[PDB]
Subunit: 285 residues, 5 copies
Amino acid sequence: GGMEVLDLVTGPDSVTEIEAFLNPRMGQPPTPESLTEGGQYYGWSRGINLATSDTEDSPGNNTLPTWSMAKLQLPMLNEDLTCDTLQMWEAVSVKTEVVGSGSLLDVHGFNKPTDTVNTKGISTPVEGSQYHVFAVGGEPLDLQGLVTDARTKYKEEGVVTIKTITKKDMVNKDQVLNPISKAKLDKDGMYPVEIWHPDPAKNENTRYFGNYTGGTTTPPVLQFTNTLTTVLLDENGVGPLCKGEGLYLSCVDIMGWRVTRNYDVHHWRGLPRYFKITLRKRWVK
Amino acid sequence: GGMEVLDLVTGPDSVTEIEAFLNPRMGQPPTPESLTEGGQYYGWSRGINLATSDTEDSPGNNTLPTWSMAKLQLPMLNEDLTCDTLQMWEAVSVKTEVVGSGSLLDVHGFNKPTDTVNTKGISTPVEGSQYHVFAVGGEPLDLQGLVTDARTKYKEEGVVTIKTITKKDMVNKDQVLNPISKAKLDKDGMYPVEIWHPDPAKNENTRYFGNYTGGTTTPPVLQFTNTLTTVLLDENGVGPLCKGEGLYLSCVDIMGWRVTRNYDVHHWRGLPRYFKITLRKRWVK
Amino acid sequence: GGMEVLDLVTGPDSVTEIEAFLNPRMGQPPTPESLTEGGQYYGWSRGINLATSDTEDSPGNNTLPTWSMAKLQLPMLNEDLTCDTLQMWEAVSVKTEVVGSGSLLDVHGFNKPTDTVNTKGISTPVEGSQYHVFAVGGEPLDLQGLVTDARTKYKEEGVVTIKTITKKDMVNKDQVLNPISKAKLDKDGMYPVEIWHPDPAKNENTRYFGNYTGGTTTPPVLQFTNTLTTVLLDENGVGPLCKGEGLYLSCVDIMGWRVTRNYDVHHWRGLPRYFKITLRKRWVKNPYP
Amino acid sequence: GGMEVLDLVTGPDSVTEIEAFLNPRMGQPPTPESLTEGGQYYGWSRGINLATSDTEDSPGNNTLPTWSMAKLQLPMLNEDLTCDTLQMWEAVSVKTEVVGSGSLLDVHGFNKPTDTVNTKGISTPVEGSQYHVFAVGGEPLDLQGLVTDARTKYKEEGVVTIKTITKKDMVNKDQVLNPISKAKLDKDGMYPVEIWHPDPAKNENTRYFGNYTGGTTTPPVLQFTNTLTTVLLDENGVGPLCKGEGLYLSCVDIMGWRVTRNYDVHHWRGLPRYFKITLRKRWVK
Amino acid sequence: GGMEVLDLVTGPDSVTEIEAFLNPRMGQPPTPESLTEGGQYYGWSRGINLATSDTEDSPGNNTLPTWSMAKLQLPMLNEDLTCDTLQMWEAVSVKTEVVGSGSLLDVHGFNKPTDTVNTKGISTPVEGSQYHVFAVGGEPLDLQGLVTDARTKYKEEGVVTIKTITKKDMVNKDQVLNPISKAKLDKDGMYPVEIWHPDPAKNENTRYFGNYTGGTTTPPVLQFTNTLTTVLLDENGVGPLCKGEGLYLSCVDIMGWRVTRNYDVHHWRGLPRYFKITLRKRWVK
Ligand SMILES: CC(=O)N[C@@H]1[C@@H](O[C@@H]2O[C@H](CO)[C@H](O)[C@H](O[C@]3(C(=O)O)C[C@H](O)[C@@H](NC(C)=O)[C@H]([C@H](O)[C@H](O)CO)O3)[C@H]2O)[C@H](O)[C@@H](CO[C@]2(C(=O)O)C[C@H](O)[C@@H](NC(C)=O)[C@H]([C@H](O)[C@H](O)CO)O2)O[C@H]1O
Ligand SMILES: CC(=O)N[C@@H]1[C@@H](O[C@@H]2O[C@H](CO)[C@H](O)[C@H](O[C@]3(C(=O)O)C[C@H](O)[C@@H](NC(C)=O)[C@H]([C@H](O)[C@H](O)CO)O3)[C@H]2O)[C@H](O)[C@@H](CO[C@]2(C(=O)O)C[C@H](O)[C@@H](NC(C)=O)[C@H]([C@H](O)[C@H](O)CO)O2)O[C@H]1O
Ligand SMILES: CC(=O)N[C@@H]1[C@@H](O[C@@H]2O[C@H](CO)[C@H](O)[C@H](O[C@]3(C(=O)O)C[C@H](O)[C@@H](NC(C)=O)[C@H]([C@H](O)[C@H](O)CO)O3)[C@H]2O)[C@H](O)[C@@H](CO[C@]2(C(=O)O)C[C@H](O)[C@@H](NC(C)=O)[C@H]([C@H](O)[C@H](O)CO)O2)O[C@H]1O
Ligand SMILES: CC(=O)N[C@@H]1[C@@H](O[C@@H]2O[C@H](CO)[C@H](O)[C@H](O[C@]3(C(=O)O)C[C@H](O)[C@@H](NC(C)=O)[C@H]([C@H](O)[C@H](O)CO)O3)[C@H]2O)[C@H](O)[C@@H](CO[C@]2(C(=O)O)C[C@H](O)[C@@H](NC(C)=O)[C@H]([C@H](O)[C@H](O)CO)O2)O[C@H]1O
Ligand SMILES: CC(=O)N[C@@H]1[C@@H](O[C@@H]2O[C@H](CO)[C@H](O)[C@H](O[C@]3(C(=O)O)C[C@H](O)[C@@H](NC(C)=O)[C@H]([C@H](O)[C@H](O)CO)O3)[C@H]2O)[C@H](O)[C@@H](CO[C@]2(C(=O)O)C[C@H](O)[C@@H](NC(C)=O)[C@H]([C@H](O)[C@H](O)CO)O2)O[C@H]1O
C-alpha cells in the first residue's frame, strides 16, 4: 500500500542478523583452481595491458576489477498481502570489515625488488591506487556510468559496460555526467568499477559509503575491528527497507597493485569484505 | 519590507527538495561532440601551454578551468507582494557528492607510462593539484579576484577576468587583496578558478565550502556517500533566503592532471557534482 | 548454554586489574641470549630471504613475524558450576601502549647510510610497512587464513600455517576468503601474521583492533600515553566474558624494517605492548553444558 | 580600574561587528606599484639569498616574510572615566579566512618546469614550507624571539630583530628560549616570522592560533568557508577585552615557494587573510 | 596516611598556577656560550657520528638528545603533620606549547642546498624524525629502558644508560621489554631518549603524552595556540597528587635534523616547551 513508515514490530523473531562475505572480483575468475593454470591469480587481476595509441585502447576483461554483489534471502513476513498495513524488513546497522591486510606483509616473493640496480632488497609490496566502497540495500545498487575515455574499446561480452545498456557507442558526455548512462548492480563480477559508480540521484533504499586514494606508489592504509558499527538509519530514523524480501550487498576493495620483474607488469590486488547486518521488522501502510 | 526573519511556514507544500548535477568546466566545451574533433577532451582541459618568458604569459581559454554554476527556479509563493509579511524560500541543507572517482582507476590508457625507460608499467593515473568548492545561495556567489601574476595576458573574449570588470589592466595589488577586483558568478564556464575566489566580505546569503591541495604528483583523495548532509543554517538557525525565487548552485572539482607521452603535456581533469537541496518556506517581514 | 547476562556483582573484590606485557615475535627467538650467536637480532627478524623464481618461494621461519599471545589466570569464583546463577569475569576496558618508539631515534648505527656516495650521513632509521593489532578476550583469538600466494612453501615444522590445520596444501581460494582455513591463536610466536587474521565471523567473546600502513619507506608513526582507555563493552554494555577463567591477550606491533649495508637486506622491527585490563564480576544464568 | 568581569551590557548598540583584511608581508613592499620596477613581486618575497659560509649569513630584508598587523578603532563607550564600574569591548568570536589558494592553480607561468630535460610539462606550482598564524586581542601580540642561528647578520635598518630590542648582539641562548628576547607586534611588515613567535607566557588578552608544516616540496593544503566561527571566549566565558579601545589583528600566511628557471631561485608566497570579529560590551569593575 | 581522596579545599589561596619553560637538551650543553667555541650548536646536537662496524657503535654524548626535566616547588600546606586528614596539591590541567617552529622558516643559511649540482636553491630546512613527549607529575617520570642495539657502546660518564643502573652490560632482552631495566627521570640532560621511555607499568602519579614520526626527510609538523588546555584528571576526576610538595615537568621535542654541506653531517634540532599548570588543594585521608 502507501509507503508510510509506522511502528517497529515487537514480539518473537522481530529482529534478526545476517552474515556474509564477498570475495573480490579483480579480474581472474575463481576457476580454473589450478595454481599452474591461472588459479594463482585469484584475488588479483591478470597483467594490465596498455593502449597501443591514443585511439586504440582495448583492456582485457580479466584486467578490470568489477563490483562484488550478493542477494540474500530474509525470513518471510506477510501471509495476507492485501491488508492495509504490512510488515517489512528494515536494515538498522552493519558491522563490515575488509579482511586480510596482514597478507600484504609478504615481501619475500618474486615481485620487482626494492633495489633494481643489483636486484636485491625485498619483494616490493602492494602499493598505489586504492578504492573501497560498500553498500547495503533493499534493491540492487543504482549505478551511474562515467569513464575516463569514451573511446575505450571494452569487450562486448564478459562485462557490462555503457554500450551493453544503451546498445550504442559511448558519447563524449560519458566522460562527465550523462543521465542516459545508468544501470543496476544485479550481477557479481560483471560491472567494471572504472565505469559504474553509485548513483546519488537514486538509491533511495540503499546506503553506500566509498573512498578513493590515487597515485602510483601510494602506501595502502586500512583499519579493521569487530567493534565498529555502521548505522544505516536515515535522518528520520528509518533504515533501508526490503520491498522484495531479498537484501543486497555490494562492494569493491582495491588495495593497489603488485609489480612483476618483467616490464613492470601491474596486477590489481583486492581483499574480501565481511558483512553482519542487523535487521528489524517495520509496520508499513 | 524589512529583512526580519520570523516563523517557519507550515501546511501543504511548505517544504520541498531540488536536485541537480553540475558538469565540470575544465576547458573543453561540451561541443563539438565528435570524439575526433575535440569532444574526446570533454571533462578535461586542452593541453596546458606555458609562458614563453617572464613577461609573456598567454594561457589558452580552453586550458583554464572555470566555475560551474546553475540558477534553478523554485515554486511560487507570494500572491500579494505589498503585504507586511511575506514568504521566502530558505535552504536548510544539501546532500552533495562528487561522482566518478572510480573512473580514475583506468590505468590502461596511453598516458605517460610509469616505466618511461622501457615505455611499460601502467598509464600514469591523474595526480597533482586538487581543488573542491561548492556553494548554495539566494544570489550569485560573490567573487574576489586574486591572481598569481598581474602581468598574465588572459584573452579579452571567451573568459571573464579582472580586466573585463574594471575595464583596465590588472595592477600589482591584484596579486594580494584588492577590494576593487570583485564580480559575481552569473555565468557557467566563464570565470577562471585561478582568478576568482569566494568573497568572504559578502555572500551574506550564500554558504560556500572549499579546500585545496597542491603539488605536482600528489595522490588524489575523495570520499562519496549518500548519507552525509551539509547543514546550511547559520548560527541563528537561518539558512540562505531566496529573495528572488532563483536558487544558485556553484562549484568546481579538480582532481589533478593526466600527462601525455608527448613532452609531458598536462590536461586538467574535473568531475561532476550532484546537489539535493532541502528548502522550507519562511515568514519574513 | 543460555548465556543470560544479569546484574554487576557488588561487594569486596568484585573488581580487579590485570597487567602484562607481551614481547614481539619478529623471527629471532629469545634464545640464544649471546649477542654474537644470534641474540643480537632479538626484537627483529633475521634477514628476509627472497623467492628464487615465480614458483620457488621458501621464506625462512625466522624471517616471518608471528602473533604474540598470553593466557592469564583470573581469581576463581564458582566452586560449583551447577548453580542456576553464577559469577563470571567481565573485561570492562584496557589501557594499552606500544613501548619503545624512541629507540627508533638511534641513527648512529651501521645500517645502509643516507649518503651512499661517501658512506656518510646517518644510519637509515626503521621505515616501511607497519602493522598494529591487539585483542582481549575470554577465548583464544579466532583466526581466518588468507595469503598473498597459495604456492608459498612455508616450512612444515616451526610455524603453524594453513597446511598444519587442513593437512593439505593451500588452494587458490586461500588468496581470498576460504572458510575452511581457520585456526585459533593458542600459542605464542607460532602463527605468521602474513597468514592469520582476526576472524570477523567469530570472536564473539573477544574485542580486536587493528590497523595497517604499507609501503617500502613509509615513515613510522606512533602515539603513547597513559591517559587513554579502550572501552571493551559492546553496544549493550557487556564486555568479553571469561567462561574458563583464563584471559587472552594477543598482539603484533611491526614498526617497519631496518636495511643493512649488505645487498639491502631487511630486518623486521617489532616493539613490546603493555596491557592493563580492568575486570568486574557479572551475575549470569548458568551457561554451562 | 580593577579587572573584575561582570555582566554583559544590554540595550541599543551593545554588540557590533568589525571587518578587515590583512595583506601578506612576504618581502616586497606594496610600492613601487610598477610591474617592471618590482611591483610584480608584491605578494611574494624577492629572491632568497644564501649564506656564503658558516659565519657569513646576511639575508636581505625583502627576502624575509614578516608579521602582518592592524589596530582598529572601536566605537566609544564611557563618558565619565572616573567611575567605579565601566564598560569594555569584548571580542566574542571571529570568522577568519585565507583568500586566494585557487590562484596557486596557475601552472602556466615561467617557473622551473616539471620536465627539465625538454623544458616542458607545467610551471611548477608553489610548494614547501607553510606557516599559518592569526591572532585577535586587546593589546599588541606579545612576541618571544628564537632563531635558527644567533650568528645571522640581520640588517640593522628596516626590520625589528632581537638586537634592535636588546641593543646587543644575539647570544647562544637565542637559539632556544631566552626570556630577555621579547617584543610586541606593534608594526606591520617589520617583525620577521623566523625570529618572532607568539609568547605563551604573556598574551593574557589575546588569542592566537598557529600551525607549521616544513619540507622543501611539501604540497600546500588549505580550507576556506564562510561557515566556520572561531570562539574567542576563555574557559570562564570571557573573550579578549579592549582596555585601550583599539583592537589588534595579527597574522602570517605562507603557502610555500615558487622556483625560477635561473639557478632555482626561490620566492616566498603569502596570501591575504580576512577577519570578521563579533564584539559585545561588558561591565567591568 | 591513607591515600583516600576527599573533597576539594575551598577558600583563599586554594587554587594556584605555576609557569615554566624547559629548554631542549639535544647534545650541546648551554656552555661554553661562545658562538665560535661550541655555543653555536646550543639547541642542536653536535654532528652525528656513525658506527665503524656491526660490532663497534660508540656514539658521542653530545650527539644524543636527552630528556629535559625540572622539579618545581609549590606553596606550603599542612601545619599539623600528624592529622587524620591532610591537604595535597592536585594538578588539574596544563597549557603546554612548543615554541619557535617559525625559526625553521630560515632557509637562507649554509646547509646542504636544494640544488647541489650548482650549489643554489635554498638552504635545506630541518626535516626527518620527530619526537614529542611531555609529562606532569608528583614524582619523577618512571622510565623503562629499551634500545635498538644492546651492543651499543655508550660513554660511561656524562649520560645515564642501562648499564649505569644495572652495573652490568646490556643483554639481548634490552632490545625488547626487560623489566630489570628501569630508572627515574631525576636529572635534566642526562637520560638519552633513544634509551629511556615512559614506563606504562608505573607513573601512577604522572600523566604523559607522546608521539613519534620517523623517516629521513619527513616534513616537520607542529601546532601552537594559547587556547588549548590539557586535562590531567583521571577517570575518577583526580589529577596527579604532589606527595612531597615538588612538581615534576618532563619533555623532549625533536623537530628533525639539519644537514651540512660536509659529508651530509646531521645535527638534531630541538625546541623549548612552555608549561602553565593549574593546581588546587585536595583533602586526603
Ligand atoms: C595467455 C596469453 O598469452 N594470452 C594473450 C593475452 O596476453 C595476456 O593478457 C593478459 C591480460 O588480458 C595478461 O596481460 C597476461 O600477462 C600475464 C598474466 O597472465 O597475467 C602477466 C603475468 O605477470 C605473467 N606471469 C609471469 C610469471 O610472468 C603471465 C605469463 O607470462 C603468462 O600467463 C604465461 O606465459 O602473463 C598476458 O599474457 C593478449 O592480451 C591477448 C589479446 O591480444 C590482443 C587483444 O585483444 O588485446 C589482440 C589484438 O589484436 C591487439 N590489438 C591491436 C590493435 O593490436 C591487442 C593489443 O596488442 C593490446 O590491446 C595491447 O595491450 O592484443 O592474446 C592472448 O593470446
Ligand atoms: C591545433 C593547434 O595546433 N592549435 C594551435 C594552438 O595549440 C594548441 O593549443 C591548445 C591550448 O590552447 C592545446 O595546448 C593543444 O594541445 C593538444 C590539445 O589539443 O589539447 C594537447 C593534446 O594532448 C594533443 N593530443 C594528442 C593526441 O597528441 C593535441 C593534438 O596534438 C592536437 O589537437 C592535434 O592537432 O594537442 C595545442 O595543440 C596554439 O596554442 C594556438 C595559439 O598559439 C599562440 C597563442 O596565441 O598563444 C600564437 C602566438 O603568436 C604565440 N605568442 C608568442 C609571443 O609566441 C603563442 C605562444 O607561443 C604561447 O602562448 C606559448 O604557450 O602561441 O595556435 C593554434 O594554431
Ligand atoms: C647460517 C646460514 O648461512 N644459513 C643459511 C641461510 O642464511 C641465513 O638465512 C636467514 C633467514 O633464514 C637470514 O637471511 C640470514 O641473514 C643474515 C642474518 O643472520 O639475519 C642477515 C644479517 O644482516 C647478517 N648480519 C651481518 C652482520 O651481516 C647475517 C650474517 O651474515 C650471518 O648470520 C653470519 O654470517 O645474515 C642468512 O645468513 C639461508 O637462507 C639458507 C638457504 O638454504 C635454502 C633454504 O631456504 O632452505 C636451501 C634450499 O635448497 C634452496 N632452494 C632452492 C630451490 O634453491 C633455498 C633458496 O636458495 C632460498 O629459498 C632463496 O631465498 O635456500 O641456507 C642456510 O644455510
Ligand atoms: C640588482 C642586484 O643585482 N642587486 C644585488 C642583490 O641581488 C638581489 O638580491 C635580492 C634579495 O635581496 C634578490 O635575490 C634579487 O633576485 C631577483 C629578485 O629581484 O627578486 C630574483 C628574481 O627571480 C629575478 N627575476 C628574474 C625575472 O630573473 C630578479 C632579477 O634578476 C633582477 O631583479 C633584475 O635586475 O632578481 C637579487 O638580484 C644582492 O642581494 C646584493 C648582495 O650584497 C651584499 C649584501 O648582502 O648586502 C653585499 C655584502 O657585502 C655581501 N657580504 C659579503 C661578506 O660578501 C653580501 C653577500 O654576498 C650575500 O649576503 C650572499 O648571499 O651581499 O648585491 C646587489 O648588488
Ligand atoms: C674537533 C674534532 O675533530 N674532534 C674529534 C671528534 O669529532 C667530532 O665529533 C662530534 C661528535 O662527538 C661531531 O661529529 C663533530 O662534528 C662537527 C661538530 O662539531 O658538531 C660537525 C659540524 O658540522 C662541524 N662544523 C662545521 C662548520 O664544519 C664541526 C667542525 O668541523 C669542528 O667542530 C671544527 O673542528 O664538527 C666532530 O668534529 C671525535 O668524535 C673525537 C673522538 O673520536 C673517537 C671517539 O668516538 O672517541 C676516537 C676513538 O678512538 C674512535 N674509535 C675507534 C674504534 O677508532 C672513534 C670512532 O672513530 C667513532 O666512534 C666513529 O664514529 O672516534 O675525536 C676528536 O678529535
